[PDB]
Amino acid sequence: LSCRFYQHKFPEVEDVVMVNVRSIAEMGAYVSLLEYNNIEGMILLSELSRRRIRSINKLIRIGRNECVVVIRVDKEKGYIDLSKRRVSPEEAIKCEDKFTKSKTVYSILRHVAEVLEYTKDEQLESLFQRTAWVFDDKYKRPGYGAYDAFKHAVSDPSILDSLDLNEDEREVLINNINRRLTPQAVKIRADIEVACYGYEGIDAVKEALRAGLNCSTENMPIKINLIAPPRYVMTTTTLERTEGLSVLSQAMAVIKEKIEEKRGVFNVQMEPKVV
Amino acid sequence: GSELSERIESFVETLKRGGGPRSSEEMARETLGLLRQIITDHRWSNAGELMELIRREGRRMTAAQPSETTVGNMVRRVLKIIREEYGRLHGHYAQLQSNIIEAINELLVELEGTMENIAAQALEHIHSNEVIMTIGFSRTVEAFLKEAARKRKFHVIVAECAPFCQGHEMAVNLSKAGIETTVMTDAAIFAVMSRVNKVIIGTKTILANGALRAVTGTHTLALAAKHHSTPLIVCAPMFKLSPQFPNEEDSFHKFVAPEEVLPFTEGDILEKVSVHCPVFDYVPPELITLFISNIGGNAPSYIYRLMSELYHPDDHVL
Amino acid sequence: PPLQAVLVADSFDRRFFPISKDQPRVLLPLANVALIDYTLEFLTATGVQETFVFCCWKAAQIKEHLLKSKWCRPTSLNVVRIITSELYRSLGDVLRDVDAKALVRSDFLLVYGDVISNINITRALEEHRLRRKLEKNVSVMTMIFKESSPSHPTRCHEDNVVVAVDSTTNRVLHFQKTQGLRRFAFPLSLFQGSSDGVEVR
Amino acid sequence: QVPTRKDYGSKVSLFSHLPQYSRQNSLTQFMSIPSSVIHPAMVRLGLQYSQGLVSGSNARCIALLRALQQVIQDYTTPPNEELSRDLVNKLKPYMSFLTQCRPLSASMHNAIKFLNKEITSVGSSKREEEAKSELRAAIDRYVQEKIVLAAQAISRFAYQKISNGDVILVYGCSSLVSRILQEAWTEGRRFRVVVVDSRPWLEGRHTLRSLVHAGVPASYLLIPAASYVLPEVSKVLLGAHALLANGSVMSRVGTAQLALVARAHNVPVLVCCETYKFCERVQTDAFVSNELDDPDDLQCKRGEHVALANWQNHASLRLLNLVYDVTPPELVDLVITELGMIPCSSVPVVLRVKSSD
Amino acid sequence: QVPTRKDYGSKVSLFSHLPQYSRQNSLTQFMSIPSSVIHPAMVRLGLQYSQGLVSGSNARCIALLRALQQVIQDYTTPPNEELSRDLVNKLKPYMSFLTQCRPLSASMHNAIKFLNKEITSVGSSKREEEAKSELRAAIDRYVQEKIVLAAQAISRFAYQKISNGDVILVYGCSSLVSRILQEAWTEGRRFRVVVVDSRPWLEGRHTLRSLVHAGVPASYLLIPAASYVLPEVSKVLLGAHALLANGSVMSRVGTAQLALVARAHNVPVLVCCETYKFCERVQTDAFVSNELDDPDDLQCKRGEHVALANWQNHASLRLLNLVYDVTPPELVDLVITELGMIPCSSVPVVLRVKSSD
Amino acid sequence: MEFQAVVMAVGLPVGNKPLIWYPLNLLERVGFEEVIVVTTRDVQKALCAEFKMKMKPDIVCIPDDADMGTADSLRYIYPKLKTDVLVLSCDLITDVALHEVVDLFRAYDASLAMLMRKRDFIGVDSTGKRLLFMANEADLDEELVIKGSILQKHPRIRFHTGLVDAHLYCLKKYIVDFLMENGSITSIRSELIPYLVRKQFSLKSLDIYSFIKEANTLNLAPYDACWNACRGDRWEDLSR
Ligand SMILES: O=C(COc1ccc(Cl)cc1)N[C@H]1CC[C@H](NC(=O)COc2ccc(Cl)cc2)CC1
């Protein structure tokens, strides 16, 4: 039970596709196009590298996935010429991210069709054309548009209500999207050693703790706990950890400023790191 | 800047203290990663400045561990890649850097598939009901034997090493595949050489004249194989091939602590005794019959051409 | 958790006289290298993150010796903390200044400034950590010894050590030296406290 | 009756005819505590042979001849029987028990043959205690000359060969080579000795002790480092256990390998063998007549990674440690016997002048 | 489609991976009479290969290239398909059937590699008959130069080496050796040739015929008397069938043996090999890659006592006749190619200047 | 003959079977066609007529005196012993085959070989065979003393405290010659153990060996081990 990843059965010219090498011949390397329902392609022996290559098996690695640019395509003859020489590392990283997002969308729709028990490949292809390829044709972006629409539907399900597949198929697709692409959970923990060996030591410590807890933003409460007498643990359980680490660093800087204003030391035992 | 210098210092200290990492393939991959991290975060106008920078860093990398020549000839291969790119772009700042980056990328693709190519060409060197002799422990000859035993039935005599028995783990890893592994000591080599059909071993460093340094006790094994006229096979990848001549530079063998040979609980005789433990041994090219690498089989009278395909004679001093 | 260490760089025994009257005994060269550099290289080969060097006599000379070394560089993975005071004259005084300053956190190393070693004690550190975790902070000190012969020229008659430990959980029950003793006496309560196993080493 | 010892572990297919025992089990588990069918001195000799307490060939022959003296001293004569046939018929179960305890060295075989030739030529007109005293005096004189007079003559012939300032290489543990080195150091020669050792016996440390208590500068290396030291070595001294008919050297296992590496480093080897350790039986390899020690001796404590602990659970795993091997006669140059310095090609010829011919 | 031939007789345990067929049975018992899955020229080539009618390596390569020319002449192009890989996919069952008929020589492997490199590099803009004529002309020019121009250059390089009055020793059957001897006899050199032969092919008599029809004085001997004649022989001229990467000479079985006896009699050997019979594949023995001939070819008629008649009834009886073996590179001195006289140690080097590099 | 087995009788067959039969069965099972058994006379001088009512192959029973110890019974049979002595006792329930202690006596050429099983501190060498020290906590003024020579020649000594003495000894002829020459010894278990253990701390010397069994244990003269005699004999004497 399989299908292609996009609405086209064949890739365009100069389009970088993700393949896996299946066999080695004298004319080149027979590969399978993983995002086009495992159609057979060929990476040429002249296009495997920019350097004189003694053997095809020195850089083939049959069983390894690689990004190759299409040089020649023939829909009538069934000939697909691929090339590893033309692709750049930036284009390879772009093709890897695009193939990862398209494989995630393929796994989500495969789980949705397994929940719907659609054993026929034509009904599964109609679910593909009604869920992902419509958004890919509307946004004019194969792979990016369907994944962006699914990431928007995981937050706001009004985009999934426009699909007219079925009454239960849309709910199963929304449940699969919310179970697969909505893992918004992180915990940015940090340790800070704030104290004050002065007159009002515990009072300044409680004031610095209240000033650090007051700087906690919405949906990101910086919870302070007494892990030790001289050390404290400032945890933060929230999504968007790139912003959560910055919020924890800002709270630690505010606590250090409040400790230094009341003549007290404030050391950073641990920086903002995810748990 | 800071990250580069601390990674370089940690690499130098890890090569200075012990074997970090264990396998030589991960050491070659982290050497490629260190070299690419150096060249993407530096500034140069001419290729000779990058050549002198890589030379100055490689001098420290060979001064850290002179026995580990994998980083040295890998730095030399990267230097010849720089020389070939400057030659093909001279007859150049971002395009040259992208060419060096993709050359290092395809070199890493070549380096990842050495063992699978050696295991793929292992079938044309092993026949059924064969007596195999192997000294030491290396994953290359282990993958060689465990792929040749998928369709053939033969016997491997894994000889242990006398300073530290590294052949025992290889023997219990080969016996899980069922190749009828025979384990013995180092003193029985000639005492088994009248029945050994072919000797298949690995090495640590392939020298420039076809000679090789390897684990100790294999010069005796190669002498016994020359005495009994059995062919010798070296399953070695293409990053253990070095242009360092044997009698040219000093510090050839790596001498380690004598506690593995003579323990500290021996008594009062440890003061009036001189215990040496050379972990490496030198094998001349006349005792070698065939080298096996990922590009195929080669004579010991051909390794110079591989030098002419991988190293420049101006980079031999580093 | 990090791995702290303290280094007593002033041996308080009057033994290297009059050698230690000019430069201290931790700055003497074994083979063109002072014993401070040997002990610090052993500490970085162990895997410690921060050390605490304690030196009282000629401490300015030790400080100017080790500031130009490899371990005071900012690229060093193991930082050092030079602590200078002429008040202490004992290792117990060093450890009580450690307690008064509250430098260490948990399971810190203790070494003299003239110790030559290459042992990786991560196995012994994990053994000490599990013995503290099961028995709830009952095990406090893990002494380290090397298997040697009594006739070896390394161990002399002034520093020969005889212990009496357990065989299956290697806890020390008796510990003494042979400084002018032809006959050794061991207590009797070590057998009544542990009826499972005992071995004199 | 004496049962057969069970073969321990899985044998090598090339060593299916040679027995492979273990030291953890003993033959006396089903034997009487007052030793009746075997002599108590004989079962003491077999127990100290099987456990590895007596490993040197000269020490094995000396302890065997002492046990035979204890047998002859505790010997009685049955009625209507002669000594010269009943002693031959009774010593063969003792030698079979000794072979079952450990495969016998060739010095023990020649001692058995000499004792059988001595007790065969005992006249019927002689008395019991007179013939017993004659046999004890013959055994005493035999062990006296062919141990200490042969050792003194071999050391005297080796003293005029070792020069001053040379480097000698030894291998294994043997009393003759250590006596040669001790007498050469005490008689005036100044030299240093390189000791080469092998696993799993580690017996060379033993002779290393006799190289330290004598005051000789010694260097302790191994078998794989022998190819490293032999460019500096000028002479290789070897302790021989047996010399076959074709000139082969049956000794410890790292000898013909060491002789091949020494010939490959242009170092002439020197074996030392007494005349009673010669052989009429000849073999050309280490595969048709050899001793197999314990397969559990090969394991060692390298950290906590003993790989050969449960080696019997692996069906395709064979363990082996060879004790003896032979050398081609074109590798060994000197043989120092008490009659002088001979080549290997004349070691049957000396047999012709020592078999009453 | 095409079944596999049954292995005849009981194989050697050392040669269990290599196939052993018989000439009495063929695969075309289970094939169609109008050959559709195999070409008629290709099945004719396989039939004349399996019966032993074409035994020389150059004759096998010439007949193989003629069969491939007949394949290309009777080739058609299917719709919406390219020639450049459909010809590869159609030639692979032909080569697999050829391998099932007989294990292929290395010259056939290099011809297969050259033809695959030629039919890979054909352009898409070319027509059908134009590309077919281009491939036929390329095969004709390739076999023309790398047979007759290489043979003429090797004979010219051997003419300046053979002096007047020496004795040459040859072995086996090859057109290159006979052409060298014929051109050396007709161009002025006066010599006599010892033709050394072996069982069971007896093919060297063929070369002996081309030594009598040319007027050369010849002496027909066998391989056990080769040690007898080599004291008189000054030069050994061999015919190489394949040269591996390490300098080995894969040829008929009496080559490495004959080269060892010639080195033991101080007679330098001379192999003659064209460049297209080289190998990137390397091997060190005659066990990992070898041809097995018929096991019933070793029997003969020595009166009325044919002992190997009912050899299959004996269960503990193995019959074996090897076809090829390799030589050590330290035994062979000459390699006479059209580029000159090189040693064996540079036979991969010329491969580097013949693989478009 | 190598050994002459002597069974001691000091202050007896109180159990499910005769208490003297199990050492006699242990002797007569493996060898020992000549068995010497002494009689008891401290409690009652009539156990010889009860011991002579057995069905063994050959028993030699002799009368003894009332006020006597173990060393007095060793010195009493001195003109009738010609070989090595292998001492037994009445309360000796041993399911361990005693061939291994004879192997330890023969193989190392030991002068004394004993068997213990799981008050007395026994310090044995790290191999587990050759004993180096043994002492009870009764007749010692201090706790213990250890010389420097036994720690120089043997740097690690494993001590055991939960051991019992099975009274299975193997004596040499010159040891009982010294016992006949030195009549100050009364208890052989406290004299031949301690004096030889002190004389072993001297090269040319004597060897003392011991095996620590882990299968069963012996009995005692008092009623503390009398309850484990029947429970040990009901499950181990079926195979005997
Ligand atoms: O069993 C083994 C194990 O080898 C060893 C294992 C351990 C040790 Cl220490 C030594 C050797 N090797 C076999 C391998 C096949 C051979 N040969 C045959 O079985 C058949 O003999 C022939 C028959 C025909 C030819 Cl053409 C060649 C050999 C016998 C020995």
mmCIF file of C-alpha atoms in Angstrom, chain E residues 64-182:
data_model
loop_
_atom_site.group_PDB
_atom_site.id
_atom_site.type_symbol
_atom_site.label_atom_id
_atom_site.label_comp_id
_atom_site.label_asym_id
_atom_site.label_seq_id
_atom_site.Cartn_x
_atom_site.Cartn_y
_atom_site.Cartn_z
ATOM 1 C CA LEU E 64 32.982 -14.094 -29.135
ATOM 2 C CA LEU E 65 33.391 -10.781 -30.966
ATOM 3 C CA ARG E 66 32.171 -12.411 -34.196
ATOM 4 C CA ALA E 67 29.104 -13.709 -32.335
ATOM 5 C CA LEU E 68 28.518 -10.226 -30.905
ATOM 6 C CA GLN E 69 28.808 -8.764 -34.418
ATOM 7 C CA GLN E 70 26.155 -11.252 -35.556
ATOM 8 C CA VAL E 71 24.023 -10.219 -32.558
ATOM 9 C CA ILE E 72 24.325 -6.507 -33.403
ATOM 10 C CA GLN E 73 23.582 -7.155 -37.099
ATOM 11 C CA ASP E 74 20.343 -8.989 -36.164
ATOM 12 C CA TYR E 75 19.334 -6.430 -33.522
ATOM 13 C CA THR E 76 16.132 -4.395 -33.557
ATOM 14 C CA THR E 77 15.012 -1.452 -31.461
ATOM 15 C CA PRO E 78 11.743 -1.635 -29.503
ATOM 16 C CA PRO E 79 9.519 1.458 -29.338
ATOM 17 C CA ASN E 80 10.012 4.084 -26.583
ATOM 18 C CA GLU E 81 13.313 2.488 -25.509
ATOM 19 C CA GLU E 82 16.951 3.510 -25.840
ATOM 20 C CA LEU E 83 19.651 1.223 -27.216
ATOM 21 C CA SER E 84 22.268 2.228 -24.608
ATOM 22 C CA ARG E 85 20.818 0.084 -21.797
ATOM 23 C CA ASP E 86 18.392 -2.253 -23.580
ATOM 24 C CA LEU E 87 21.429 -3.732 -25.329
ATOM 25 C CA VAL E 88 23.088 -4.132 -21.901
ATOM 26 C CA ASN E 89 19.970 -5.800 -20.474
ATOM 27 C CA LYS E 90 19.766 -8.111 -23.478
ATOM 28 C CA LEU E 91 23.483 -8.969 -23.458
ATOM 29 C CA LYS E 92 23.454 -10.008 -19.788
ATOM 30 C CA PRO E 93 21.391 -13.230 -20.318
ATOM 31 C CA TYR E 94 23.709 -14.029 -23.245
ATOM 32 C CA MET E 95 26.797 -13.678 -21.043
ATOM 33 C CA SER E 96 25.103 -15.623 -18.230
ATOM 34 C CA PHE E 97 24.336 -18.448 -20.676
ATOM 35 C CA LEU E 98 27.953 -18.284 -21.865
ATOM 36 C CA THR E 99 29.127 -18.573 -18.250
ATOM 37 C CA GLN E 100 26.791 -21.530 -17.699
ATOM 38 C CA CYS E 101 28.240 -23.216 -20.797
ATOM 39 C CA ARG E 102 31.864 -22.643 -19.705
ATOM 40 C CA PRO E 103 33.618 -20.435 -17.118
ATOM 41 C CA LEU E 104 34.689 -17.378 -19.075
ATOM 42 C CA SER E 105 38.283 -16.371 -19.687
ATOM 43 C CA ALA E 106 39.539 -12.943 -18.668
ATOM 44 C CA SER E 107 39.886 -11.809 -22.288
ATOM 45 C CA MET E 108 36.153 -12.440 -22.686
ATOM 46 C CA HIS E 109 35.519 -10.418 -19.508
ATOM 47 C CA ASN E 110 37.577 -7.503 -20.834
ATOM 48 C CA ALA E 111 35.796 -7.733 -24.198
ATOM 49 C CA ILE E 112 32.447 -7.628 -22.357
ATOM 50 C CA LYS E 113 33.635 -4.574 -20.395
ATOM 51 C CA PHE E 114 34.871 -2.816 -23.550
ATOM 52 C CA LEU E 115 31.635 -3.550 -25.416
ATOM 53 C CA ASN E 116 29.571 -2.276 -22.476
ATOM 54 C CA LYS E 117 31.677 0.898 -22.394
ATOM 55 C CA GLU E 118 31.169 1.273 -26.159
ATOM 56 C CA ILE E 119 27.390 0.725 -26.167
ATOM 57 C CA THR E 120 26.993 2.964 -23.121
ATOM 58 C CA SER E 121 28.616 5.946 -24.876
ATOM 59 C CA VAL E 122 26.365 5.996 -27.968
ATOM 60 C CA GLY E 123 24.435 9.206 -28.516
ATOM 61 C CA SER E 124 20.659 9.495 -28.518
ATOM 62 C CA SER E 125 20.660 11.573 -31.725
ATOM 63 C CA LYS E 126 22.172 8.702 -33.730
ATOM 64 C CA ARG E 127 20.000 6.425 -35.845
ATOM 65 C CA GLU E 128 19.578 2.663 -35.493
ATOM 66 C CA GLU E 129 21.586 1.367 -38.459
ATOM 67 C CA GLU E 130 24.147 4.171 -38.081
ATOM 68 C CA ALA E 131 24.849 3.212 -34.460
ATOM 69 C CA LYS E 132 24.889 -0.475 -35.445
ATOM 70 C CA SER E 133 27.464 0.191 -38.184
ATOM 71 C CA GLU E 134 29.467 2.337 -35.741
ATOM 72 C CA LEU E 135 29.478 -0.478 -33.167
ATOM 73 C CA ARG E 136 30.450 -3.063 -35.800
ATOM 74 C CA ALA E 137 33.284 -0.849 -37.068
ATOM 75 C CA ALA E 138 34.439 -0.204 -33.489
ATOM 76 C CA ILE E 139 34.490 -3.946 -32.713
ATOM 77 C CA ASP E 140 36.331 -4.624 -35.997
ATOM 78 C CA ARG E 141 38.951 -1.920 -35.366
ATOM 79 C CA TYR E 142 39.369 -2.994 -31.721
ATOM 80 C CA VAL E 143 39.924 -6.672 -32.524
ATOM 81 C CA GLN E 144 42.126 -5.634 -35.479
ATOM 82 C CA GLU E 145 44.591 -3.523 -33.493
ATOM 83 C CA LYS E 146 44.523 -5.431 -30.183
ATOM 84 C CA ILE E 147 45.036 -8.766 -31.947
ATOM 85 C CA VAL E 148 47.258 -8.381 -34.977
ATOM 86 C CA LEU E 149 49.051 -5.077 -34.239
ATOM 87 C CA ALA E 150 49.779 -6.236 -30.691
ATOM 88 C CA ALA E 151 50.957 -9.621 -32.010
ATOM 89 C CA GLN E 152 53.234 -7.982 -34.596
ATOM 90 C CA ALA E 153 54.711 -5.619 -31.998
ATOM 91 C CA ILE E 154 55.234 -8.441 -29.476
ATOM 92 C CA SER E 155 56.918 -10.550 -32.174
ATOM 93 C CA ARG E 156 59.132 -7.591 -33.124
ATOM 94 C CA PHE E 157 60.110 -7.074 -29.479
ATOM 95 C CA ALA E 158 60.818 -10.803 -29.126
ATOM 96 C CA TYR E 159 62.886 -10.880 -32.332
ATOM 97 C CA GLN E 160 65.479 -8.500 -30.852
ATOM 98 C CA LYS E 161 65.732 -10.722 -27.740
ATOM 99 C CA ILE E 162 66.096 -14.212 -29.246
ATOM 100 C CA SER E 163 69.694 -14.693 -30.381
ATOM 101 C CA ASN E 164 71.164 -17.311 -32.734
ATOM 102 C CA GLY E 165 71.765 -20.825 -31.446
ATOM 103 C CA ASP E 166 69.849 -20.719 -28.162
ATOM 104 C CA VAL E 167 67.196 -23.159 -26.934
ATOM 105 C CA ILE E 168 63.642 -21.940 -26.299
ATOM 106 C CA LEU E 169 61.102 -23.768 -24.131
ATOM 107 C CA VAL E 170 57.368 -23.336 -24.746
ATOM 108 C CA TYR E 171 54.253 -24.723 -23.078
ATOM 109 C CA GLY E 172 50.615 -25.141 -24.039
ATOM 110 C CA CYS E 173 48.765 -23.928 -27.110
ATOM 111 C CA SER E 174 48.524 -20.266 -28.099
ATOM 112 C CA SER E 175 48.584 -18.477 -31.445
ATOM 113 C CA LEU E 176 50.877 -15.723 -30.139
ATOM 114 C CA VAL E 177 53.723 -18.084 -29.179
ATOM 115 C CA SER E 178 53.505 -19.928 -32.510
ATOM 116 C CA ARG E 179 53.443 -16.612 -34.395
ATOM 117 C CA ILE E 180 56.493 -15.396 -32.433
ATOM 118 C CA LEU E 181 58.408 -18.596 -33.210
ATOM 119 C CA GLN E 182 57.369 -18.543 -36.886
#
